[PDB]
Design a protein around this ligand. Structure first.
Ligand code: K6U
Ligand code: K6U
Ligand code: CL
Ligand code: ZN
Ligand code: ZN
Length: 567
């Protein structure tokens, strides 16, 4: 404990030896407390082209603006045995066609020169060019090999930002989980890593085709706060598939950063509290998505075991039950994984039958308490895959004029328009703001083409931003391109779509269908309102307002792609 965190604490104390004090009025009960020292904007391009939404509070309010300090109990021995056996088996299946390996300074740099979230000289782009930086990384690296840590400290402020060296060492040991697609559907059977929002609907419809009960989609209440040290230890078992230096490097990240956290927090009363804890996910973990998917996969298989009566009690797992659990995993494990879609803490399960709905003992004792339902109330499942929520979306089964079947993602249009009106960060030029507006417009044309208001606004934004300006943004992002959007649509929805047998390209946007008008209004369309009919009729005037602001550039008119504007 203090042997593992003291060095980190000792170093921070010394760097602020003039302001250190063991404050007696600290709000921490479940976080160990050590001491203290002394210490959204609106996108105008999108907003000017979505004027009807200026008076919709669900849109406008999105742009305005005690669970971490909690303690989950040690699971019963029967639960701990259920997890350990499932986790050992799960790492084995994930590793059958994948090779754990170290990630490199070289591939780590290709991310810093591509402006990706690293959780980190002025910027990360500077420090990587300097060899003095890497001389410090080696200091720490060598420390980790000697079972010690000095500078890997989390900074509470959405992400816990670290010194660039700690973000590499984490990427070095565990990045393979991310970049080698361990949670791909092909590899993990439950996962959807890299699948893309145009595949999730088809994936849920394939789960629907299985024989069984309702589809269950129970959200966990603060998943990250509910991660036990037993979960963290089952996650560490990935090191059993590793070797040499990699194994030592990964074991250290697990032992010294994950299973013992050190965090520097702000407190207005403004001191920097230095707190520590062994459990929870926290933030700061670059493989949070992957390890959440892993632990959720494990929890959901055990819940499936409980519904099938593979075991009677969580209090003590009997050895006859132990072999039965192992025999279940080996004979039907893969079949039960294929009955799920799991994205981090998010899941959809189509179990063998509806006993799953009241199989709650293991799930509650693992600490994965369901959101907004009494602890022992049975889960309410969905009878129709087109109603199940997943990754903040639902999915419509749309029919093209020619009988081919699109499965399309959808959410409340107020949520889509409200997010596109927001920019994160400072120092945006007009040109940068317009290129972000164009990324949203191209995303809408690819994913939400079936919503009347989003096709029209997306065409208006692409008409209002210079044709050749590149979309920017500080799973799959096929809208991030200057290629023609009809061509990308044909690639994504027809050519590369493994659920479409007939590969005949579409030759115009008018051959690409909308939802029914009533279904469009149900999902938030303003089609039918006077404000929307004025907006639509006078759209060239809004486009010209934004063209005048940006100035004398090469623009294309995309509105004639819509039949009504086509003269
Ligand atoms: C956005 O992801 C990251 C990228 C880099 C470093 C950390 C994270 C992270 N931490 N917790 C969740 O993510
Ligand atoms: C699979 O997710 C990632 C891929 C790449 C980089 C970071 C992440 C991540 N961040 N927090 C969780 O995962
Ligand atoms: Cl339903
Ligand atoms: Zn360290
Ligand atoms: Zn919808």
């Amino acid at each position: 404990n203090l042997d593992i965190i003291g060095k980190r604490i000792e170093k921070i104390k010394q760097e602020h030896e003039t302001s250190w004090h063991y404050d007696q009025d600290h709000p921490y009960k479940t976080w160990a407390y050590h001491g203290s020292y002394e210490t959204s904007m609106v996108n105008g391009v999108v907003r000017l082209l979505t004027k009807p939404w200026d008076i919709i509070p669900m849109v406008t309010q999105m742009a305005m603006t005690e669970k971490v300090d909690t303690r989950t109990q040690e699971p019963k021995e029967g639960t701990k045995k259920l997890m350990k056996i499932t986790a050992e088996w799960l790492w084995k299946e994930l590793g059958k066609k994948k090779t754990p390996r170290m990630c490199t300074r070289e591939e780590f740099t290709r991310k810093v020169r591509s402006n990706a979230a690293l959780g980190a000289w002025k910027s990360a782009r500077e420090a990587v060019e300097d060899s003095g930086f890497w001389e410090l990384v080696d200091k720490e690296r060598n420390l980790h090999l000697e079972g010690k840590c000095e500078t890997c400290v989390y900074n509470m402020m959405a992400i816990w930002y670290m010194w660039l060296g700690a973000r590499f060492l984490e990427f070095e040991a565990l990045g393979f989980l991310n970049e080698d697609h361990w949670f791909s559907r092909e590899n993990s059977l439950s996962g959807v890593e890299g699948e893309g929002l145009h595949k999730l609907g088809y994936i849920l419809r394939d789960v629907s085709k299985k024989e069984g009960g309702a589809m269950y989609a129970d959200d966990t209440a603060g998943w990250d706060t509910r991660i036990t040290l037993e979960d963290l230890k089952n996650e560490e078992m990935v090191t059993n598939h590793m070797e040499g230096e990699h194994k030592k490097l990964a074991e250290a990240i697990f032992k010294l950063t994950y299973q013992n956290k050190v965090v520097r927090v702000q407190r207005p009363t403004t001191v920097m509290d230095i707190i520590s804890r062994r459990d929870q996910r926290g933030s700061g973990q670059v493989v949070t998505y992957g390890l959440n998917t892993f632990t959720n996969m494990e929890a959901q298989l055990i819940r499936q075991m409980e519904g099938e009566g593979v075991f009677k009690s969580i209090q003590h797992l009997t050895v006859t039950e132990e072999i039965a659990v192992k025999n279940w995993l080996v004979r039907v494990g893969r079949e039960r994984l294929s009955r799920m879609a799991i994205s981090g803490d998010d899941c959809v399960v189509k179990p063998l039958d509806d006993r799953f709905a009241s199989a709650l003992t293991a799930l509650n004792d693992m600490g994965k308490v369901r959101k907004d339902i009494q602890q022992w109330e049975p889960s309410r499942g969905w009878n129709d895959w087109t109603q199940v929520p997943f990754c903040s979306h639902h999915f419509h089964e749309l029919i093209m004029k020619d009988g081919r079947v699109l499965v399309v993602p959808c959410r409340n249009q107020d949520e889509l328009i409200g997010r596109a009106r927001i920019s994160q960060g400072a120092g945006w030029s007009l040109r940068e703001t317009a290129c972000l507006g164009k990324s949203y417009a191209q995303m809408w044309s690819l994913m939400y083409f079936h919503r009347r208001d989003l096709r029209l606004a997306a065409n208006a934004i692409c008409s209002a931003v210079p044709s050749h300006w590149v979309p920017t943004s500080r799973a799959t992002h096929e809208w991030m391109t200057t290629e023609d959007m009809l061509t990308v649509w044909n690639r994504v929805w027809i050519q590369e779509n493994p659920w479409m047998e007939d590969k005949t390209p579409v030759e115009s946007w008018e051959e690409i269908p909308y939802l029914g008008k009533r279904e469009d209004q149900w999902c938030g369309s303003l089609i039918g309102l006077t404000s929307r009919a004025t907006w639509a009729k006078n759209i060239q005037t809004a486009i010209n307002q934004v063209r005048s602001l940006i100035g004398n550039e090469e623009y294309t008119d995309y509105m004639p792609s819509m039949k009504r504007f086509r003269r």
